[PDB]
Design a binder for this molecule. Structure first.
Ligand code: CA
Ligand code: CA
Ligand code: CA
Ligand code: CA
Lengths: 89, 9, 89, 9
């Protein structure tokens, strides 16, 4: 596998590591999303320590309004992050 | 690589 | 960096490896897109050997109609690929 | 992992 293919696999792997913890196994609830960000995105995003920030991030990502972040909505988040990284080069 | 939260939210 | 962060970086790296070859350095023209797919996505997609397929893939990905695939449109392609990989598990 | 082109195009 190429670096791009490895990246594709890592996206799938990390989403499901967190989404499968509790409740719906195919979606991230607030606590699963918070832990994903805090543990896995610490070089790109400040640690989330406040409920209001958890709530706002979920509200931002939950495009379909069901209160959880599904895989499509997670991919849109990843695109936001990758796009923002352009500021650094 | 710190992205300001305000550019995400 | 986490596996997710490494994946973010790899996405950026591969896009720009190909987009920077010719013309606009921030977009993939047809030939750059074809080579990216053929070299970097060979485990997920059949090799492109026909102009019609190059043309259809570009038409599919070029959401803004400018004839090239920009970074946003590339991220949407990556989301298509990652989503389709769910068939395999 | 072969994804059929028709599911992309
Ligand atoms: Ca869950
Ligand atoms: Ca949702
Ligand atoms: Ca180019
Ligand atoms: Ca375009």
């Amino acid at each position: 596998m190429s670096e791009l293919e490895k990246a594709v696999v890592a996206l799938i792997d990390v989403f499901h590591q967190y989404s499968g913890r509790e409740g719906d196994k195919h979606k991230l609830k607030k606590s699963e999303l918070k832990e994903l960000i805090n543990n896995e995105l610490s070089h790109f995003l400040e640690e989330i320590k406040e409920q209001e920030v958890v709530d706002k991030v979920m509200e931002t990502l939950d495009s379909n309004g069901d209160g959880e972040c599904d895989f499509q909505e997670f991919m849109a988040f990843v695109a936001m992050i990758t796009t923002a990284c352009h500021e650094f080069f | 690589t710190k992205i300001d939260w305000n550019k995400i939210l």
